[PDB]
């Protein structure tokens, strides 16, 4: 079963360099080209370069040669990315992807995607999240049903991983995407249960940030 | 390098309905193999791309045949005979013809769903927050649609604009609706020194803005 597990998200300052992985598994990996595709928020797509692991040749956009650099592990079976001279400009999502064009066929096989690496590329130091219970007090619903919240705020960098009751809770859930001001970032979440669930049982919000090796677990109370 | 131009950069269309998006590039994608390498992709939101369609018209695997692709030289189209729920996203032709390889734009599809109505609800600084001489008052707009949307803060009647932090959640391919979260933060300080705190959101559903509201006394 093809799968391409990608790194970490990696906060890294800029001027220095990164290397993102990409270990594969399920195919011959000397048989198959594997690209390295760039997203950065704003829906664009961009094409880095390839590489054949079989015989470690390797074809680049002008636009990166320089930039980056491709190279692959037959033992392990990973291919590999190393980008240098970071600047804000290049923080974004990186994709390795395993396309699938058989060249002396000129051909297709299925395409499988690497799940993405994030990467942040800022000299803000790394912030742990203030997390705060939102209880009604006027905006609710109230009868029938009740909607709650959470508020994580001033943490960096990016990701944070929010559940509720473990993520037992997932209907009417709704977790706000992260928005940065000043170097910190701030997320919200609300639920909607019934008003029979809520304050009867518990309804706590799990909140985790591992830059900062935090884990937190707020409890919603009236 | 060539260009490739997508259109429209967005459409809004109904379950049931067909669509179709285009794709133009500024040279000819026919290579001397006499093949063209153009292929469309999807990219459904929180998940990496995916092929729908390769060599202009061929179907991945896995893949409905609601898509269809066509053209030639220059002009290409996507064609789904039928919307679902699950096509919302955002669709790319690449060419490979030319080195180096070229994305078009993306187009966002869109599911048209009839007009909801938000469901608001306000909520005061937590006893925490206030703890560290800060207080967000937070107001959240859940399940509407269309997505645009406008809400003011008023704080003692009067409108505040700075110190709001707005997140706008995107379509839900559940119920084709999106949400949003507005936080006004504010000092301690400043805000045990007013009264009533309101959200409103104007939205097409109504002429009369929803508004919620909460007055701080004691208790
Ligand atoms: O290399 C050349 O100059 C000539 N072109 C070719 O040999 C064929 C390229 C075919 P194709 O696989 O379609 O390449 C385009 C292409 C490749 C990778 C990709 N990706 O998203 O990973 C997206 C698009």
């Known amino acids: 079963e093809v799968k391409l597990q990608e790194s970490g998200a990696e906060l890294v300052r800029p001027g220095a360099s990164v290397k993102l992985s990409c270990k594969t598994s399920?195919?011959?990996?000397?048989?198959?080209?594997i690209h390295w595709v760039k997203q950065r928020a704003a829906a664009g797509l961009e094409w880095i370069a390839r590489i054949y692991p079989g015989t470690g040749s390797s074809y680049y956009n002008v636009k990166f040669k320089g930039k980056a650099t491709l190279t692959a592990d037959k033992s392990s079976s990973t291919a590999y990315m190393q980008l240098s001279s970071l600047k804000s400009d290049d923080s974004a999502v990186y994709f390795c992807?395993?396309?699938?064009?058989?060249?002396?066929?000129?051909?297709?096989?299925?395409?499988?995607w690497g799940q993405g690496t994030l990467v942040t590329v800022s000299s803000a130091k790394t912030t742990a999240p203030s997390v705060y219970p939102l209880a009604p007090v006027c905006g609710d619903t109230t009868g029938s049903s009740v909607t709650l919240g959470c508020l994580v705020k001033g943490y960096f960098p990016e990701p944070v991983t929010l559940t509720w009751n473990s993520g037992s809770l997932s209907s009417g859930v709704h977790t706000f995407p992260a928005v940065l001001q000043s170097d910190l970032y701030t997320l919200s979440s609300s639920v909607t249960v019934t008003s029979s669930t809520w304050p009867s049982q518990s309804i706590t919000c799990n909140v985790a940030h591992p830059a900062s090796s935090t884990k937190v677990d707020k409890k919603i109370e009236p | 390098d060539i260009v490739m131009t997508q259109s429209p950069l967005t459409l809004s269309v109904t379950i049931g309905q067909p669509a179709s998006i285009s794709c133009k590039s500024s040279?000819?994608?026919?290579?001397?193999?006499?093949?063209?390498?153009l292929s469309w992709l999807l990219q459904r939101p929180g998940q990496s791309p995916k092929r729908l369609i390769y060599?202009?018209?061929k179907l991945d695997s896995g893949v409905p045949d609601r898509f269809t692709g066509s053209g030639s030289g220059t002009d290409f189209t996507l064609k789904i005979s039928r919307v679902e729920a699950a096509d919302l996203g955002l669709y790319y032709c690449?060419?490979?013809?030319?080195?180096?390889?070229?994305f078009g734009g993306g187009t966002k599809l869109e599911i048209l769903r009839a007009d909801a109505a938000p469901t608001v609800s306000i909520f005061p600084p937590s006893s925490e927050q206030l703890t560290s001489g800060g207080a967000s008052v937070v107001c959240f707009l859940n399940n509407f649609y269309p997505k645009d949307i406008n809400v003011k803060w008023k704080i003692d009647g009067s409108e505040r604009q700075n110190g709001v932090l707005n997140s706008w959640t995107d379509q839900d391919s559940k119920d084709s609706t999106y949400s949003m979260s507005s936080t006004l933060t504010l000092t301690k300080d400043e805000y045990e020194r007013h009264n009533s705190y309101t959200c409103e959101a104007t939205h097409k559903t109504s002429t009369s803005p929803i508004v919620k509201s909460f007055n701080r006394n004691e208790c």
């Open positions: 399920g195919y011959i990996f000397t048989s198959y080209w």
């Open positions: 040279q000819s994608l026919l290579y001397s193999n006499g093949k063209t390498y």
């Open positions: 992807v395993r396309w699938g064009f058989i060249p002396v066929r000129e051909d297709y096989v299925l395409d499988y």
């Open positions: 060599l202009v018209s």
């Open positions: 690449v060419q490979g013809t030319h080195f180096p390889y070229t």
